[PDB]
Design a protein around this nucleic acid. Sequence first.
RNA 1: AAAAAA
Lengths: 386, 379
Amino acid sequence: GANAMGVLISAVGDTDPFRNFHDGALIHIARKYRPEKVILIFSEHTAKKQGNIEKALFSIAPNYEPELIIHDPIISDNEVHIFDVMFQRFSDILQEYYTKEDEFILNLSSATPQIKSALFVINRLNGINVKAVQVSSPEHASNENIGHDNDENIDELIEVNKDNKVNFIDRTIEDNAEKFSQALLKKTARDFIEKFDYKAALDILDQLSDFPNLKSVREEIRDVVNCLSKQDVPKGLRHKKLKEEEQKILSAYLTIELQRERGNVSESFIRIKNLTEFILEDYIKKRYPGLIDEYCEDYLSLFDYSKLLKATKEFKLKRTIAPIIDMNSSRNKVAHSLSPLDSDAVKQLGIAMKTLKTLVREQYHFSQSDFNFYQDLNKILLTKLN
Amino acid sequence: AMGVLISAVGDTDPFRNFHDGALIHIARKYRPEKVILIFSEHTAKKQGNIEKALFSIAPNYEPELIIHDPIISDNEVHIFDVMFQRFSDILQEYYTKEDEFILNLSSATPQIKSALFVINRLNGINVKAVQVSSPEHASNENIGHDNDENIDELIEVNKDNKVNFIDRTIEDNAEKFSQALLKKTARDFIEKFDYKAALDILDQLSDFPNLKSVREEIRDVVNCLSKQDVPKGLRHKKLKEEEQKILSAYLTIELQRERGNVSESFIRIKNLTEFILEDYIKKRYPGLIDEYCEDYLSLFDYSKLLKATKEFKLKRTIAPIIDMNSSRNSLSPLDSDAVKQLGIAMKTLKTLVREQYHFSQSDFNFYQDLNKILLTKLN
RNA sequence: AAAAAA
């Protein structure tokens, strides 16, 4: 299609078009950047000045003929000062006019603070990141004790205006929102962490400008990410109170809970069988040395362990794993098939879950606190990320 | 547990136009036990008048006044990003969970008032934030500043100096801005394929036109994927049922690699490869598998069936995946030699299905393309 | 309602 035009989106305030022998923000940005289109957002208070605005814009240079879009509806005066209302209004306005194709400029220095705030914020909250320009006061200080030129003769203001030259003094400052963009990225990293997407959180942290806590937070998350992918035990779960296999059991269990939270239900069924199998092997090797080797004159399965628990009169434990044995058919669908699970097969996972937990709680005496590893880690990580 | 007002100081404070400025008006209404004052160079000049005004509210009301150090340079007080960082730091310095804070959204430069409005929600503290409306209830154009006047005169003629003053405060609850931050979080989740986390946000959003559409789209994905089913969007009418199962299960493996969950993918790759081979043999050699089943079939069986049919190119192609059987088989950790195996099986598998089923570049891009539509609807 | 309640 056609090539990009420069479009200046701007509101209008008491300092437009001119004040104190100088350009207001709107005219100054137009004068410097010469946009082809200018979308003008008025309020009831400022609409009376529409003609003087267009006169001022066509007064800049003789071959400068900007296309002036006068937005509709204008902004009601009893809304123009409310923060949250103007945020919505200028979200709506910016979605109405933004195009990927053109090259936009936001005037951050005309109208109420609630409108200027909204423009500054939305530019980055919605990731359009167009050019955002402030215009300094010519006082380079408070405009206290400096009046408004709105009741004056427009043609005079145009003539006396000190910016009415080719070599005007540039009072424009471009915003790049470096610090604010970091806060938005950190917010995303925190959102990811709360929901246990540690890999996605780590991707954000690798692209962050440095600050004190950044390297330890990144180091803590990397170890979690790396170990979990390799199906290892993160350093944080290698409690010295626990034997090595207890650490593997505790971590493998907590990973299925993470898996459940993230909606990976079908993958849970293979993990529950493997963990239960590992726990039973561990229990039988510890309690009946040489039993498994005798049996193995034939990898053992839940069914083999069930027989061994009968042979050893381990009758409570035999009933404990019965719900996990029931979901054997569904585990088979996720392990040797592409057939889908029904909603009943799903609800099993909740039952096996409550069972798995009472199992590991009973055999290894994990505390409520031990089960809370990732929640408690998140707490500390989040505070370290502002 | 005490009430604490954080406030900058502007040209309208302490008094203007026979009325409270924002700082005094908020203090007069809410009576914070503590008031943290952030001056700039320009406004520090009237510190004494500010304190006199604050103590002039009531004889039995003495707020504890904290004069923040360092004051803000006038040459930064007007820049958006700088003032955002500055007041982000200030709020972290003073915030406690035990107290109850108030933010004055109506004193100092627009960049300072914007910073206060934004950080309150961006950073989740969500304390009370108050605007004070001009007594003109309109533009203060043509209204001067009373900073050069007599402070005692101002205090006495102040129309607000009374028990039943006109309440000009407006409490900000940032309903729309809070929704935008939730939408941004939902967008961020979608780009990274956490459809479940995105769904949980969308279930908490105030309704807007597209919401129900976007909700249903994601719910179908989350629900079908959790049951190892095929999302409706992947049931392409151009595809045989089992080709849809194959395309979906492949893309699910890709999703797990993106989310870092490599551990899962080895069992997924085996079943998908087993399913492809059985598809290929059932089509090409009718009854062969039944003949073979005279004494669930595994990769080893399909390998022998490929041998028996002299399909040696195919038997060779699936060799990386059979090699992976040691790693796919407990609770020991994968080493990095096995992590690279998965990467190769993934390329092997992709080329297999491209040959066997002729999936297009676009077909493999289902989730990326769906995210595009979802994201636009969530702006 | 440009660097200071609309």
